[PDB]
Each structure stands twice: as C-alpha cells, then as structure tokens.
A paper describes a structure:
[name] (DHQase) is the third enzyme in the shikimate pathway. DHQase catalyzes the dehydration of 3-dehydroquinate to 3-dehydroshikimate. There are two types of DHQase: type I enzymes catalyze a Schiff base mechanism using a catalytic lysine residue; type II DHQase catalyze the dehydration reaction via an enolate intermediate. DHQase from [name] is a type I enzyme.
Residue numbers in the entry:
A (entry chain A), B (entry chain B): 3 to 227, 237 to 251
Write the structure that this text describes.
Amino acid sequence: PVIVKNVRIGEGNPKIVVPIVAPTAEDILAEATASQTLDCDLVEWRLDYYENVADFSDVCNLSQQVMERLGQKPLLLTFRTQKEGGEMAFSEENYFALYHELVKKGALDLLDIELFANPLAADTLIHEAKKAGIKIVLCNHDFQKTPSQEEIVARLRQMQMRQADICKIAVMPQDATDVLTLLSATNEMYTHYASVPIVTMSMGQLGMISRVTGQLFGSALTFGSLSVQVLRNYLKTFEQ
Amino acid sequence: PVIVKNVRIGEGNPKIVVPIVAPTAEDILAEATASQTLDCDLVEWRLDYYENVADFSDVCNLSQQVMERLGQKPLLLTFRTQKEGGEMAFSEENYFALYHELVKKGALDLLDIELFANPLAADTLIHEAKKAGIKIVLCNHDFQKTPSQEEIVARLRQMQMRQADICKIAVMPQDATDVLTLLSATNEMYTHYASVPIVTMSMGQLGMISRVTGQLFGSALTFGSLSVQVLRNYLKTFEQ
C-alpha cells in the first residue's frame, strides 16, 4: 500500500482522484482551491492542458501555488503525451526536461510517467524523482482499442518491473467483451503478480463500471471529474 | 423480447422486479398495493414464503387479490424450492399441483419453473401455462457456488431449448473471479446463443455489480427489494 499524506493507496476503498484540466493559471488555482471542499482524496493536475507548459519555470512555480491550496491532498502531476490521449504535441526532450525541472524546483507528490516513453531517460528520471520523495506512477493509455487480456497484464507487469510505485493502464472498449477483458486483466494481475498497487479502467460509457469496481477487482485509484460526489457514493454501495 | 402489459423485457434498460416475501396474506396485499408507488416494472410474489401456500385454492384466490392491486404491473409467481434457496420443504407432486391450479384458477403473467424439476411434468405444465397466455421463466439457482462459465451457458441454453420465454440463472460467488465468470457467461450467452431474453445474477455483496450491468452484458431483468429506488438510479447512470 502506497501511503502519501495519510492517504493509503492500495487499501480499503479505491481512492478518488480529481483532474484539473483548465488551461489558464487563474482557473487552475481556483479549481485547486475548490478541491478543498470536494469529496476526493487526491488531485491530478494535467500539464498538457496548461497553456504555458513550455515555460518549465512557470510550471514549477505554478505547481507550488497549486500545492499550497490543496488542503494537504496529494498532488499528482501528469503530462499526458499526444499518442496516449494528450492535448498537445511535445518533443520527447521537452517531455523529460519538464519533468526533471518539476523534480528539482516544483511541488508534487506523485509523478506520472508513460511506460512507453524512452526508458533510459525515464529510468534516470525515476531515480531522481524517488530521491526527492516523489511516488512514481508508470502508466499506459490506449484510447482506440482494448489489447488482449495477456497484453494488459504484461504491460502492468512491465511497469512493476521498472519499479513503479503504482501501475496504471487505461483502455478503450469497443464492445462489452472488451470491458470484461479489462476487468479480468485487472483481477489476474492483482491476484497473481502485483506487489504494488495497480490502477485500471475501461474508458467511455461502456467501461464506466470499471470506475466503481476497484475494490472488487483490485484497482486502487479511480478518476472523477462520473463526478467525484457520485463516485464516493457508488464506491460505498459496492463496498466489500 | 417478451412483451407483457407493455413492459418490453429484453429491450432498453433492465426491467426492475420487486419481490413480495411477506408471510401473511394481509401483508402480501399491503405490499402489492405499495408496489403501485414503487419505482419498479413488475412484481414477483414468492409463494414459498406464504404461510398458507399448501392451501392451493387459498393461493389462487390470494393471487387474484394481489393482481387487482398491481396497477397493471406484470405479476410473476414463484415457488423457489429448498434445494435452490427456497423457504420450505415441499414435495415434487405438490409443486406441480400448486402451479397447475394457479394456471387454471389463479392470476399471473409470468410463471417461474426451475430447469431441474421433473422435466416431463414440467413440460406438460409449460404448455398448459402458455395456452393460458402465461410467459414461462425457466430458471436455476445455486446459492453456494458458481459453476464454470461453460456450465452456466449450457444451463441457459438448455432452458431456451425447453421453450422458455425467459432464461434465468442466479449463482453464488466466493470471490471476484466468480463474479467475472457469471458476467462473462451472460455476455457469451447473449451474444452467441440467445434468441429469447436472459436474466443473470451473481448473488451477495461480491456480485452486486451484476445487478446494475444488465444492459451492458445482456441481462434483461434485475431484482431489488439493492432497493428499487437505488436500482433505477443506478441503471440510468450505467445506461449505454
């Protein structure tokens, strides 16, 4: 169980994550302040939405102001790359340079790193982040399709092998079978291979059940904009 | 799609069944009247709870009174046998004799017959009930375990082969894998073999999700005492 600011990720009910996707600084701070009265456990600031994300110092400073308003909720920072659903084109070099800077002079508790990004660069980044006390979330997103159950499991297993603190995968269902594929992949990974927390979801309207069944099948985080209030309520209903 | 009093079973969202399990006629009538303002689509009266179920004429008359109070919601009549989770010991002979009288002198829209009951007696009953315009629900309940995915499918296919209007199976999960097994069995039956509506569920707290996922995986009916209020709300949230 990964413990950050008293939030026990990988224990009890799935912890709730709200994303900030606002593009202006002013709205990003407002929504951070708003999280203080939202029924969630942590906050993900999505970097690839931020209009000034190419200014790495602006981002580091802004990250400080966001943290100050979070009422001691963990702050996850994520630059989702374009090939996995992200908002903007970004060179690999800028991808790793931004993260290295946040690690040095930014505020954050967890760092999102895509499994498929340049591993040599990513591994070096991982150790620099961990040294700073940042928890690592390795992750993969397929927004077009659902890989086979074995491939989802293999990807989750490769993240754990790369010393992820938390392994995450999101896949896009095209029918109800794909949702089962994701749910089963989640169950197999969790019961048989996982010794760190894992996070999975089947995206879209078809995969929505995957966002409230985390306790049953072994998914330790769920993301809420399903809204965060409905999410907590639904988690309690399906609580084991 | 089985259409009964305008309830289109097998289309759109899962239709909600509220059971009546009160033991006295007084409370059974009270609950039938109360269903008129409950957010449900039909009503199952569990005969095996009824203190006077052995008085077949009393049951026939009571069913008439129940019907008058249903605001034109379909009435499903069910005697669940002990071996399948029922409330009382009851001979095979009295089980068929009860249903036969109901077919002739009772009021009911759907009749619940268990797959494993004496099939020759059961088939003769089925044609008599259909002749009286009654829909047949062939069904199986395992309240202690979950059979293999293939067996669940085979039982559902056997129910359809015996000319069921609706095929139903409830199984008992012992872990998360068992719930998936049931959900997967549902999906496979629905997509590859079903030409009549099917109803599936994984019992208990573990399998609670299978009560709100009918539209996604192919289950046409869901039962709520989850309460009927919560159920409809939850069906709308996960609606496709």
